[PDB]
Amino acid sequence: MTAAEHGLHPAEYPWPQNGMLSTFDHASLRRGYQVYKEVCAACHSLDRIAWRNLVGVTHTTDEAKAFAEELEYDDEPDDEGNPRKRPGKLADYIPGPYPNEQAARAANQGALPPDLSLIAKARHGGADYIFALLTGYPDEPPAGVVLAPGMNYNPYFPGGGIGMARTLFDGVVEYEDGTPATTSQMAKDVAAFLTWAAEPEHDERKKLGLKAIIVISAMLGLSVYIKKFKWSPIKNRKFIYNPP
Amino acid sequence: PDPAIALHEAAAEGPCHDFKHHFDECVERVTKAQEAEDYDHAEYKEDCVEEFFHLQHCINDNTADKLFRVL
Amino acid sequence: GKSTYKIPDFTPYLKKDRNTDANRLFSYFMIGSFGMLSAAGAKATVQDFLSNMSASADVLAMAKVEVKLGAIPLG
Amino acid sequence: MALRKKNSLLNMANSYVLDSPQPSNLNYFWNFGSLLALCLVIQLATGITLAMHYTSHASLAFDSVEHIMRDVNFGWFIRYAHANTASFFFICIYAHMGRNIYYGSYKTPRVLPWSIGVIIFLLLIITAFMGYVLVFGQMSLWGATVICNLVSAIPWLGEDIVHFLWGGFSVGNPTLQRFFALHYLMPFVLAVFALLHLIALHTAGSSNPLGITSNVDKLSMHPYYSFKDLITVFAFLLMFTLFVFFSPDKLGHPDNYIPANPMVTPASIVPEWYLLPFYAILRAIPDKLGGVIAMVAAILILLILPIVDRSIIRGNAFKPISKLLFGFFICNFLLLGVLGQVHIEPPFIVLGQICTIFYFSYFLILLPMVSTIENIFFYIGSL
Amino acid sequence: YMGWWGHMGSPPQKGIAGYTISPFAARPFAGVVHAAIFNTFRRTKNQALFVILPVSFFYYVWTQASEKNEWLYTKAGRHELAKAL
Amino acid sequence: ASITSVVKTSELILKSPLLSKIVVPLAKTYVKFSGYRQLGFKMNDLIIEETPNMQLALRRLPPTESYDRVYRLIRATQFSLSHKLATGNDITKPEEDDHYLIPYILDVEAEAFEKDALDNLEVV
Amino acid sequence: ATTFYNVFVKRNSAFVATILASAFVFDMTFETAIDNFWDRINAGKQWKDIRHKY
Ligand code: HEC
Ligand code: HEM
Ligand code: HEM
Ligand SMILES: CCCCCCCCCCCCO[C@@H]1O[C@H](CO)[C@@H](O[C@H]2O[C@H](CO)[C@@H](O)[C@H](O)[C@H]2O)[C@H](O)[C@H]1O
Ligand SMILES: CCCCCCCCCCCCO[C@@H]1O[C@H](CO)[C@@H](O[C@H]2O[C@H](CO)[C@@H](O)[C@H](O)[C@H]2O)[C@H](O)[C@H]1O
């Protein structure tokens, strides 16, 4: 297959979470949530994430309750069996922009924007692919490329023509921590946030792995000593043969 | 402004200059070929995707670490 | 080569202090450490693994029912 | 008389794990048998636990796996342990089978444990294939579709058999629910056959790296091989830890994190890595039925090693030419694996055919010829 | 072809005296450094060709095949690709 | 393959001058690279024994030959488990690599094959 | 060494009790040690480090 059909392979960026002992940067996760909420969430759902998931990762209990309480969710029917709405709770999932696929495609010239909850695991490249894609729209497609109508050129996307246009531009978001919201900074934060959304156990998993590595290595060393200790009578055995 | 704009420009003029030239030459050829008539009824239409990939791959190798250092 | 009463040479391996309590105690320290890490590793493994059967996060979220009181009239 | 010998139940355990007389010179490649037993124990424990949280209905399957990852305490670990140990199971089984082929473990008097072993290997393949479908991601669905359609090649009744397997006209909910029930069962069948091949082996005992009798010099299984097994258990657990905790998705396909969609076809539909050599063999034959037969024959041909090896000596330790041929056979098997996941393009099409011919000619031509000539060289060379 | 302890199926043994010492009396790691360096080197040197020859051959075959495949799917390889299909 | 087969084919080769000129040097190199002599084995110690015919041949070994074979097997097993090679007098020299077992197995197989033939005789 | 052997090692009941008590101590202390070390190598990155802003 041609390189174009594969898509250009994203660079390996030095993410904070790269590194056997490294967690996510939670300040970046919080900023990335804000990019999700203000830019991506217009077209993309994050359906696997509940408000409670943000608590103690990016937000306090009160902030997350406030986000939930601003929305309306379907309640159980009232006593005459008529539909009712309630305010959101921490157990509720973050609601998506569209009621069904047909509505989603109608708003995006036929293309269906995927749910982003697993996108960092569902694409080769992970955070690097998301970062490369969001920052990799050239001003002009390479001479000779004919884009289908409603397609945008992006070399990281296989085949080159993606139905999503460039969306991150310097200062589309105003970060609440005073960080300069440049295209690169926003792409880095939202890629970090999406990686967390795909693998929220990441920080705990790598710490438990460090404990396991240490214990298992010590046990491996001791098991070698013990095996050698027990085998030495066999290894050291000597014979004298006197032919009968 | 976006730190990447300057880093990418510097890498194209510097360590990735040979690749930049090939991309430039390619675009010149393709544009000129599109200008010529009976291009629409040609068998093979050349693009510059390959050259573009070679250049971008090169820029990324010389920039990725620098860019994340200033974010 | 012929006499079986002449023990083959074991001097490359023999410890001088083979009959001492210190000598045995060292090897039991190694065995004991191994048993200790195996016990601590088993305990960790069992506890973390079996915890899958305790109420999951979504179940724990569906507990603690909150009820308003403004809606409820007197009597 | 000691209780471990006198009581019939204790004596069965005793005969297999304690007083069992072993050769005194087994090398570390005799440790894969206990690693395979460990993988089987891990897969049973993790698999039964996943079954407590998984839902086999197609509307909920993929989401139940996400619930395991996200909500169940340690669910991420149990899921990653189960998925990675499936790969480790195949690494250990290829090592165990490679040991058996190099050291002549298939020769008399061990033809029966070897022949039951070949069935164990077939059951492991089926077990792993059904388990992979249960996620119900894109690779799950499309892998099930293409692999189950190979049955359509069976003449006359093939199409009918496929619809019967699927329980419908395509891979869907009926297929997923039956694969769950069979995936749960098949590991128990596998454990029985594993036990059978050991009982069959117990009549001759383990072979050994020199290929000679060990009846002259036996060691108890315990404590010698118990403590030697602990070393490779902890080495395995270190590898397990590195994948499960630090790189849990290295051995997987990202497309399996997209929910199954019968409309969109993924760019490349490949089996899991451990099935790749058999897929390359199937591609090599242009005919559909031809390809299926070749692929099955590639596993069943292991049953003829007892016949085609004409050597008067067991195993390769002392056979320089056989060792070279074995080296080429193994590397060819790895190349077939690689070719199983490339695109169907030049020049890999022809290369796959040449590697397929080499694979079969090992059994049919080279091993019978080389083993015949080495017999003559040992005789003449030592006169 | 295997009996059990006391009747294992060995031909009659006679004339061999076997000697060994207690695990507590021995140094388990005696001669470890010599073994780790010189013994491993000897054992590895004697088996090296049986690994190197097939691995190097099949790696070269792969390398040539993968480089050709890559070249056929470039612009330069258009014509050769057309013939190859 | 039967020892009978191997011995007969070898004798065809040793008869042909051309064939022996090219095969005998190869066979000697093969034996050197095989390396069984470096564990103190003789070639015949390596022959598979778990067969009725071979068990009968081994029972017919003279007691001395039998006791020496047991020692070579035990000694080689101890070299194998220690990852050492024979040194000095433990290495089998080419002149010691005698076919002590071949005559016994050839007689066992001779009778076994005659019995198979005679089980299929047809009175003419 | 004799004393230590006689008290903690000679009886297997005592040996196993000492091993289990040591495993209990190891488990608690290792937990605390790793927790602190993990917090130091990942300093300023964790929620506990930024929580004070909110
Ligand atoms: C107004 C529309 C719109 C906005 C805003 C938007 N997207 Fe998308 N996105 C799409 C559409 C449509 C697709 C599907 C494109 C296709 O498949 O051709 C898509 C696809 C993607 C993909 C998958 C590309 C692939 O490999 O399949 C990722 C990742 C993505 N978007 C992330 C983002 C992130 C991160 C943001 C913003 C911070 C974002 N999107 C903003 C419409 C949008
Ligand atoms: C030899 C034993 C086994 C092997 C090789 C095996 C293999 C597999 C594989 C490859 C998968 C797909 C894993 C993934 O990528 O997510 C899987 C999934 C699964 N297996 Fe097994 N398995 C075995 C035993 C069992 C047993 C005994 C059960 C008992 C029910 C079981 C239950 C499951 C379940 C519920 C899933 C789906 C959830 C998931 O994907 O994690 N497995 N298995
Ligand atoms: C679940 C999978 C398996 C398990 C748990 C298993 C376990 C074992 C064990 C414990 C032994 C004795 C120790 C050893 O030699 O390693 C052994 C020996 C053997 N196994 Fe397996 N095995 C499995 C699969 C296979 C397969 C697939 C084959 C063959 C294709 C096979 C063929 C043999 C043979 C021939 C022996 C005797 C080898 C010898 O000692 O010379 N086994 N197996
Ligand atoms: C053979 C079985 C014998 C009966 C034994 C019964 C064991 C069943 C008890 C399950 C106990 C789980 O108990 C609970 O475990 C988890 C780890 O799993 C601990 O959790 C602690 O470590 C984990 C990682 O290990 C972190 O995710 C967590 O933030 C931390 O608090 C809790 O502090 C503890 O209260
Ligand atoms: C490896 C998993 C551990 C569990 C063990 C497997 C359970 C099922 C094994 C039972 C199958 C019967 O297995 C059979 O048992 C008897 C006694 O137990 C063994 O008999 C062997 O040991 C006993 C004494 O130990 C002797 O009387 C006998 O001469 C000898 O052959 C057989 O060699 C074995 O083939």
mmCIF file with all atom_site columns, N, CA and C and ligand atoms in Angstrom, chain D residues 39-40 43-44 46-51 54 65 68 79 82-83 85-86 89-90 124 127-129 131-135 180 183-184 187-188 190 256 272 274, ligand 2:
data_model
loop_
_atom_site.group_PDB
_atom_site.id
_atom_site.type_symbol
_atom_site.label_atom_id
_atom_site.label_alt_id
_atom_site.label_comp_id
_atom_site.label_asym_id
_atom_site.label_entity_id
_atom_site.label_seq_id
_atom_site.pdbx_PDB_ins_code
_atom_site.Cartn_x
_atom_site.Cartn_y
_atom_site.Cartn_z
_atom_site.occupancy
_atom_site.B_iso_or_equiv
_atom_site.pdbx_formal_charge
_atom_site.auth_seq_id
_atom_site.auth_comp_id
_atom_site.auth_asym_id
_atom_site.auth_atom_id
_atom_site.pdbx_PDB_model_num
ATOM   1   N  N   . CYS D 1 39  ? -0.202  -20.992 33.060 1.00 0.00 ? 39  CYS D N   1
ATOM   2   C  CA  . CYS D 1 39  ? -1.068  -20.213 32.185 1.00 0.00 ? 39  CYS D CA  1
ATOM   3   C  C   . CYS D 1 39  ? -2.489  -20.749 32.261 1.00 0.00 ? 39  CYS D C   1
ATOM   4   N  N   . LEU D 1 40  ? -2.636  -22.063 32.280 1.00 0.00 ? 40  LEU D N   1
ATOM   5   C  CA  . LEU D 1 40  ? -3.974  -22.605 32.343 1.00 0.00 ? 40  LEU D CA  1
ATOM   6   C  C   . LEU D 1 40  ? -4.660  -22.195 33.647 1.00 0.00 ? 40  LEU D C   1
ATOM   7   N  N   . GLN D 1 43  ? -5.585  -18.466 33.372 1.00 0.00 ? 43  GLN D N   1
ATOM   8   C  CA  . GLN D 1 43  ? -6.718  -18.273 32.475 1.00 0.00 ? 43  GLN D CA  1
ATOM   9   C  C   . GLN D 1 43  ? -7.990  -18.789 33.147 1.00 0.00 ? 43  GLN D C   1
ATOM   10  N  N   . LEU D 1 44  ? -7.924  -19.878 33.917 1.00 0.00 ? 44  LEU D N   1
ATOM   11  C  CA  . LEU D 1 44  ? -9.159  -20.286 34.579 1.00 0.00 ? 44  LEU D CA  1
ATOM   12  C  C   . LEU D 1 44  ? -9.579  -19.257 35.619 1.00 0.00 ? 44  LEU D C   1
ATOM   13  N  N   . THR D 1 46  ? -8.731  -15.969 35.942 1.00 0.00 ? 46  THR D N   1
ATOM   14  C  CA  . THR D 1 46  ? -9.166  -14.691 35.399 1.00 0.00 ? 46  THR D CA  1
ATOM   15  C  C   . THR D 1 46  ? -10.434 -14.880 34.573 1.00 0.00 ? 46  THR D C   1
ATOM   16  N  N   . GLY D 1 47  ? -10.533 -15.990 33.831 1.00 0.00 ? 47  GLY D N   1
ATOM   17  C  CA  . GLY D 1 47  ? -11.654 -16.169 32.916 1.00 0.00 ? 47  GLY D CA  1
ATOM   18  C  C   . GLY D 1 47  ? -12.969 -16.343 33.679 1.00 0.00 ? 47  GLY D C   1
ATOM   19  N  N   . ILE D 1 48  ? -12.937 -17.102 34.771 1.00 0.00 ? 48  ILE D N   1
ATOM   20  C  CA  . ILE D 1 48  ? -14.158 -17.289 35.534 1.00 0.00 ? 48  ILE D CA  1
ATOM   21  C  C   . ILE D 1 48  ? -14.560 -15.969 36.176 1.00 0.00 ? 48  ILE D C   1
ATOM   22  N  N   . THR D 1 49  ? -13.571 -15.198 36.619 1.00 0.00 ? 49  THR D N   1
ATOM   23  C  CA  . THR D 1 49  ? -13.876 -13.905 37.191 1.00 0.00 ? 49  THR D CA  1
ATOM   24  C  C   . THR D 1 49  ? -14.444 -12.969 36.134 1.00 0.00 ? 49  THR D C   1
ATOM   25  N  N   . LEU D 1 50  ? -13.890 -12.923 34.918 1.00 0.00 ? 50  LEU D N   1
ATOM   26  C  CA  . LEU D 1 50  ? -14.470 -12.071 33.885 1.00 0.00 ? 50  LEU D CA  1
ATOM   27  C  C   . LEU D 1 50  ? -15.904 -12.504 33.598 1.00 0.00 ? 50  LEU D C   1
ATOM   28  N  N   . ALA D 1 51  ? -16.176 -13.811 33.587 1.00 0.00 ? 51  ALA D N   1
ATOM   29  C  CA  . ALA D 1 51  ? -17.524 -14.285 33.347 1.00 0.00 ? 51  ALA D CA  1
ATOM   30  C  C   . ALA D 1 51  ? -18.489 -13.738 34.404 1.00 0.00 ? 51  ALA D C   1
ATOM   31  N  N   . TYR D 1 54  ? -19.240 -10.206 32.707 1.00 0.00 ? 54  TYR D N   1
ATOM   32  C  CA  . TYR D 1 54  ? -19.324 -10.002 31.268 1.00 0.00 ? 54  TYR D CA  1
ATOM   33  C  C   . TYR D 1 54  ? -20.737 -10.329 30.815 1.00 0.00 ? 54  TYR D C   1
ATOM   34  N  N   . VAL D 1 65  ? -17.383 -5.230  28.659 1.00 0.00 ? 65  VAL D N   1
ATOM   35  C  CA  . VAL D 1 65  ? -15.938 -5.218  28.764 1.00 0.00 ? 65  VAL D CA  1
ATOM   36  C  C   . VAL D 1 65  ? -15.436 -3.834  29.182 1.00 0.00 ? 65  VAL D C   1
ATOM   37  N  N   . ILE D 1 68  ? -15.965 -3.611  32.938 1.00 0.00 ? 68  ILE D N   1
ATOM   38  C  CA  . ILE D 1 68  ? -14.877 -4.328  33.581 1.00 0.00 ? 68  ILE D CA  1
ATOM   39  C  C   . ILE D 1 68  ? -13.655 -3.422  33.680 1.00 0.00 ? 68  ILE D C   1
ATOM   40  N  N   . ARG D 1 79  ? -8.770  -8.143  33.285 1.00 0.00 ? 79  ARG D N   1
ATOM   41  C  CA  . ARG D 1 79  ? -8.922  -8.190  31.846 1.00 0.00 ? 79  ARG D CA  1
ATOM   42  C  C   . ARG D 1 79  ? -7.552  -8.256  31.166 1.00 0.00 ? 79  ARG D C   1
ATOM   43  N  N   . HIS D 1 82  ? -5.929  -11.605 31.574 1.00 0.00 ? 82  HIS D N   1
ATOM   44  C  CA  . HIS D 1 82  ? -6.498  -12.660 30.758 1.00 0.00 ? 82  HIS D CA  1
ATOM   45  C  C   . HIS D 1 82  ? -6.066  -12.519 29.303 1.00 0.00 ? 82  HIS D C   1
ATOM   46  N  N   . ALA D 1 83  ? -6.057  -11.299 28.773 1.00 0.00 ? 83  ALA D N   1
ATOM   47  C  CA  . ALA D 1 83  ? -5.715  -11.088 27.375 1.00 0.00 ? 83  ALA D CA  1
ATOM   48  C  C   . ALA D 1 83  ? -4.229  -11.343 27.126 1.00 0.00 ? 83  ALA D C   1
ATOM   49  N  N   . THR D 1 85  ? -2.103  -13.212 29.071 1.00 0.00 ? 85  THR D N   1
ATOM   50  C  CA  . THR D 1 85  ? -1.787  -14.606 29.315 1.00 0.00 ? 85  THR D CA  1
ATOM   51  C  C   . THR D 1 85  ? -2.223  -15.461 28.126 1.00 0.00 ? 85  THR D C   1
ATOM   52  N  N   . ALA D 1 86  ? -3.260  -15.066 27.379 1.00 0.00 ? 86  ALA D N   1
ATOM   53  C  CA  . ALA D 1 86  ? -3.492  -15.806 26.144 1.00 0.00 ? 86  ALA D CA  1
ATOM   54  C  C   . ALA D 1 86  ? -2.270  -15.783 25.221 1.00 0.00 ? 86  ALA D C   1
ATOM   55  N  N   . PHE D 1 89  ? 0.465   -18.001 26.788 1.00 0.00 ? 89  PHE D N   1
ATOM   56  C  CA  . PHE D 1 89  ? 0.096   -19.396 26.621 1.00 0.00 ? 89  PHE D CA  1
ATOM   57  C  C   . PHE D 1 89  ? 0.657   -19.904 25.289 1.00 0.00 ? 89  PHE D C   1
ATOM   58  N  N   . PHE D 1 90  ? 0.554   -19.105 24.229 1.00 0.00 ? 90  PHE D N   1
ATOM   59  C  CA  . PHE D 1 90  ? 1.065   -19.547 22.946 1.00 0.00 ? 90  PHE D CA  1
ATOM   60  C  C   . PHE D 1 90  ? 2.579   -19.489 22.859 1.00 0.00 ? 90  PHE D C   1
ATOM   61  N  N   . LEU D 1 124 ? -6.459  -25.481 22.019 1.00 0.00 ? 124 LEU D N   1
ATOM   62  C  CA  . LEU D 1 124 ? -6.047  -24.151 22.449 1.00 0.00 ? 124 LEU D CA  1
ATOM   63  C  C   . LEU D 1 124 ? -6.382  -23.125 21.365 1.00 0.00 ? 124 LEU D C   1
ATOM   64  N  N   . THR D 1 127 ? -10.147 -22.480 21.503 1.00 0.00 ? 127 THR D N   1
ATOM   65  C  CA  . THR D 1 127 ? -10.467 -21.751 22.712 1.00 0.00 ? 127 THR D CA  1
ATOM   66  C  C   . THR D 1 127 ? -10.115 -20.285 22.513 1.00 0.00 ? 127 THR D C   1
ATOM   67  N  N   . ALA D 1 128 ? -8.887  -19.993 22.062 1.00 0.00 ? 128 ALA D N   1
ATOM   68  C  CA  . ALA D 1 128 ? -8.425  -18.613 21.966 1.00 0.00 ? 128 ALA D CA  1
ATOM   69  C  C   . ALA D 1 128 ? -9.230  -17.863 20.912 1.00 0.00 ? 128 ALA D C   1
ATOM   70  N  N   . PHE D 1 129 ? -9.600  -18.536 19.824 1.00 0.00 ? 129 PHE D N   1
ATOM   71  C  CA  . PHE D 1 129 ? -10.322 -17.843 18.776 1.00 0.00 ? 129 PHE D CA  1
ATOM   72  C  C   . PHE D 1 129 ? -11.700 -17.421 19.287 1.00 0.00 ? 129 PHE D C   1
ATOM   73  N  N   . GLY D 1 131 ? -12.553 -16.894 22.337 1.00 0.00 ? 131 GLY D N   1
ATOM   74  C  CA  . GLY D 1 131 ? -12.489 -15.902 23.394 1.00 0.00 ? 131 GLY D CA  1
ATOM   75  C  C   . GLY D 1 131 ? -12.299 -14.527 22.766 1.00 0.00 ? 131 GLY D C   1
ATOM   76  N  N   . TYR D 1 132 ? -11.547 -14.461 21.672 1.00 0.00 ? 132 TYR D N   1
ATOM   77  C  CA  . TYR D 1 132 ? -11.288 -13.170 21.064 1.00 0.00 ? 132 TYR D CA  1
ATOM   78  C  C   . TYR D 1 132 ? -12.569 -12.563 20.495 1.00 0.00 ? 132 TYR D C   1
ATOM   79  N  N   . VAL D 1 133 ? -13.483 -13.383 19.991 1.00 0.00 ? 133 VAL D N   1
ATOM   80  C  CA  . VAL D 1 133 ? -14.735 -12.859 19.478 1.00 0.00 ? 133 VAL D CA  1
ATOM   81  C  C   . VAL D 1 133 ? -15.546 -12.193 20.596 1.00 0.00 ? 133 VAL D C   1
ATOM   82  N  N   . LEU D 1 134 ? -15.378 -12.609 21.859 1.00 0.00 ? 134 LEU D N   1
ATOM   83  C  CA  . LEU D 1 134 ? -16.317 -12.190 22.898 1.00 0.00 ? 134 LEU D CA  1
ATOM   84  C  C   . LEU D 1 134 ? -16.275 -10.691 23.165 1.00 0.00 ? 134 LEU D C   1
ATOM   85  N  N   . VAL D 1 135 ? -15.172 -10.022 22.846 1.00 0.00 ? 135 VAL D N   1
ATOM   86  C  CA  . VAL D 1 135 ? -15.083 -8.589  23.051 1.00 0.00 ? 135 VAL D CA  1
ATOM   87  C  C   . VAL D 1 135 ? -16.110 -7.885  22.174 1.00 0.00 ? 135 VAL D C   1
ATOM   88  N  N   . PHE D 1 180 ? -19.630 -17.677 23.792 1.00 0.00 ? 180 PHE D N   1
ATOM   89  C  CA  . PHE D 1 180 ? -19.355 -17.525 25.203 1.00 0.00 ? 180 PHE D CA  1
ATOM   90  C  C   . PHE D 1 180 ? -19.446 -18.879 25.898 1.00 0.00 ? 180 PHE D C   1
ATOM   91  N  N   . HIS D 1 183 ? -16.520 -21.021 24.833 1.00 0.00 ? 183 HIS D N   1
ATOM   92  C  CA  . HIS D 1 183 ? -15.253 -20.526 25.319 1.00 0.00 ? 183 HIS D CA  1
ATOM   93  C  C   . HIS D 1 183 ? -15.113 -20.868 26.795 1.00 0.00 ? 183 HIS D C   1
ATOM   94  N  N   . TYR D 1 184 ? -16.204 -20.819 27.557 1.00 0.00 ? 184 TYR D N   1
ATOM   95  C  CA  . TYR D 1 184 ? -16.148 -21.220 28.950 1.00 0.00 ? 184 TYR D CA  1
ATOM   96  C  C   . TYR D 1 184 ? -15.845 -22.720 29.043 1.00 0.00 ? 184 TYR D C   1
ATOM   97  N  N   . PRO D 1 187 ? -11.686 -24.649 27.793 1.00 0.00 ? 187 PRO D N   1
ATOM   98  C  CA  . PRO D 1 187 ? -10.593 -24.812 28.757 1.00 0.00 ? 187 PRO D CA  1
ATOM   99  C  C   . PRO D 1 187 ? -10.713 -26.012 29.687 1.00 0.00 ? 187 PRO D C   1
ATOM   100 N  N   . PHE D 1 188 ? -11.935 -26.436 30.034 1.00 0.00 ? 188 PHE D N   1
ATOM   101 C  CA  . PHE D 1 188 ? -12.061 -27.637 30.856 1.00 0.00 ? 188 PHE D CA  1
ATOM   102 C  C   . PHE D 1 188 ? -11.729 -28.870 30.035 1.00 0.00 ? 188 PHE D C   1
ATOM   103 N  N   . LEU D 1 190 ? -9.679  -28.845 27.564 1.00 0.00 ? 190 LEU D N   1
ATOM   104 C  CA  . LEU D 1 190 ? -8.243  -28.730 27.397 1.00 0.00 ? 190 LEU D CA  1
ATOM   105 C  C   . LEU D 1 190 ? -7.517  -29.278 28.631 1.00 0.00 ? 190 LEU D C   1
ATOM   106 N  N   . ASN D 1 256 ? -9.829  -3.360  17.930 1.00 0.00 ? 256 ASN D N   1
ATOM   107 C  CA  . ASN D 1 256 ? -10.727 -4.068  18.818 1.00 0.00 ? 256 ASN D CA  1
ATOM   108 C  C   . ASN D 1 256 ? -11.279 -3.127  19.881 1.00 0.00 ? 256 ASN D C   1
ATOM   109 N  N   . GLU D 1 272 ? -5.115  -13.029 15.555 1.00 0.00 ? 272 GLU D N   1
ATOM   110 C  CA  . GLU D 1 272 ? -4.086  -12.771 16.552 1.00 0.00 ? 272 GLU D CA  1
ATOM   111 C  C   . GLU D 1 272 ? -2.755  -13.389 16.137 1.00 0.00 ? 272 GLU D C   1
ATOM   112 N  N   . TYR D 1 274 ? -0.575  -15.327 17.122 1.00 0.00 ? 274 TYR D N   1
ATOM   113 C  CA  . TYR D 1 274 ? -0.160  -16.710 17.258 1.00 0.00 ? 274 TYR D CA  1
ATOM   114 C  C   . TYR D 1 274 ? -0.811  -17.585 16.191 1.00 0.00 ? 274 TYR D C   1
HETATM 115 C  C1  . HEM H 2 .   ? -7.041  -21.705 27.844 1.00 0.00 ? 2   HEM H C1  1
HETATM 116 C  C2  . HEM H 2 .   ? -7.787  -20.851 28.492 1.00 0.00 ? 2   HEM H C2  1
HETATM 117 C  C3  . HEM H 2 .   ? -8.193  -19.599 27.838 1.00 0.00 ? 2   HEM H C3  1
HETATM 118 C  C4  . HEM H 2 .   ? -7.657  -18.851 26.796 1.00 0.00 ? 2   HEM H C4  1
HETATM 119 C  C5  . HEM H 2 .   ? -6.458  -19.135 25.879 1.00 0.00 ? 2   HEM H C5  1
HETATM 120 C  C6  . HEM H 2 .   ? -8.521  -17.728 26.676 1.00 0.00 ? 2   HEM H C6  1
HETATM 121 C  C7  . HEM H 2 .   ? -8.366  -16.752 25.703 1.00 0.00 ? 2   HEM H C7  1
HETATM 122 C  C8  . HEM H 2 .   ? -9.151  -15.614 25.643 1.00 0.00 ? 2   HEM H C8  1
HETATM 123 C  C9  . HEM H 2 .   ? -8.915  -14.534 24.760 1.00 0.00 ? 2   HEM H C9  1
HETATM 124 C  C10 . HEM H 2 .   ? -7.852  -14.427 23.674 1.00 0.00 ? 2   HEM H C10 1
HETATM 125 C  C11 . HEM H 2 .   ? -9.904  -13.618 24.991 1.00 0.00 ? 2   HEM H C11 1
HETATM 126 C  C12 . HEM H 2 .   ? -10.009 -12.264 24.335 1.00 0.00 ? 2   HEM H C12 1
HETATM 127 C  C13 . HEM H 2 .   ? -9.366  -11.310 25.386 1.00 0.00 ? 2   HEM H C13 1
HETATM 128 C  C14 . HEM H 2 .   ? -9.438  -9.831  25.062 1.00 0.00 ? 2   HEM H C14 1
HETATM 129 O  O1  . HEM H 2 .   ? -8.694  -9.453  24.128 1.00 0.00 ? 2   HEM H O1  1
HETATM 130 O  O2  . HEM H 2 .   ? -10.173 -8.961  25.650 1.00 0.00 ? 2   HEM H O2  1
HETATM 131 C  C15 . HEM H 2 .   ? -10.737 -14.099 26.038 1.00 0.00 ? 2   HEM H C15 1
HETATM 132 C  C16 . HEM H 2 .   ? -11.824 -13.377 26.495 1.00 0.00 ? 2   HEM H C16 1
HETATM 133 C  C17 . HEM H 2 .   ? -12.602 -13.940 27.491 1.00 0.00 ? 2   HEM H C17 1
HETATM 134 N  N1  . HEM H 2 .   ? -12.428 -15.120 28.152 1.00 0.00 ? 2   HEM H N1  1
HETATM 135 FE FE1 . HEM H 2 .   ? -11.006 -16.368 27.900 1.00 0.00 ? 2   HEM H FE1 1
HETATM 136 N  N2  . HEM H 2 .   ? -9.484  -17.780 27.616 1.00 0.00 ? 2   HEM H N2  1
HETATM 137 C  C18 . HEM H 2 .   ? -9.367  -18.892 28.335 1.00 0.00 ? 2   HEM H C18 1
HETATM 138 C  C19 . HEM H 2 .   ? -10.100 -19.342 29.404 1.00 0.00 ? 2   HEM H C19 1
HETATM 139 C  C20 . HEM H 2 .   ? -11.281 -18.739 29.812 1.00 0.00 ? 2   HEM H C20 1
HETATM 140 C  C21 . HEM H 2 .   ? -12.157 -19.316 30.749 1.00 0.00 ? 2   HEM H C21 1
HETATM 141 C  C22 . HEM H 2 .   ? -11.968 -20.615 31.513 1.00 0.00 ? 2   HEM H C22 1
HETATM 142 C  C23 . HEM H 2 .   ? -13.196 -18.453 30.925 1.00 0.00 ? 2   HEM H C23 1
HETATM 143 C  C24 . HEM H 2 .   ? -14.296 -18.773 31.867 1.00 0.00 ? 2   HEM H C24 1
HETATM 144 C  C25 . HEM H 2 .   ? -15.396 -18.196 31.486 1.00 0.00 ? 2   HEM H C25 1
HETATM 145 C  C26 . HEM H 2 .   ? -12.966 -17.347 30.025 1.00 0.00 ? 2   HEM H C26 1
HETATM 146 C  C27 . HEM H 2 .   ? -13.756 -16.247 29.920 1.00 0.00 ? 2   HEM H C27 1
HETATM 147 C  C28 . HEM H 2 .   ? -13.453 -15.217 29.023 1.00 0.00 ? 2   HEM H C28 1
HETATM 148 C  C29 . HEM H 2 .   ? -14.327 -14.026 28.931 1.00 0.00 ? 2   HEM H C29 1
HETATM 149 C  C30 . HEM H 2 .   ? -15.588 -13.745 29.728 1.00 0.00 ? 2   HEM H C30 1
HETATM 150 C  C31 . HEM H 2 .   ? -13.803 -13.239 27.955 1.00 0.00 ? 2   HEM H C31 1
HETATM 151 C  C32 . HEM H 2 .   ? -14.358 -11.930 27.433 1.00 0.00 ? 2   HEM H C32 1
HETATM 152 C  C33 . HEM H 2 .   ? -13.984 -10.732 28.265 1.00 0.00 ? 2   HEM H C33 1
HETATM 153 C  C34 . HEM H 2 .   ? -12.669 -10.223 27.736 1.00 0.00 ? 2   HEM H C34 1
HETATM 154 O  O3  . HEM H 2 .   ? -12.416 -9.983  26.540 1.00 0.00 ? 2   HEM H O3  1
HETATM 155 O  O4  . HEM H 2 .   ? -11.778 -10.024 28.552 1.00 0.00 ? 2   HEM H O4  1
HETATM 156 N  N3  . HEM H 2 .   ? -11.777 -17.565 29.392 1.00 0.00 ? 2   HEM H N3  1
HETATM 157 N  N4  . HEM H 2 .   ? -10.247 -15.332 26.411 1.00 0.00 ? 2   HEM H N4  1
#
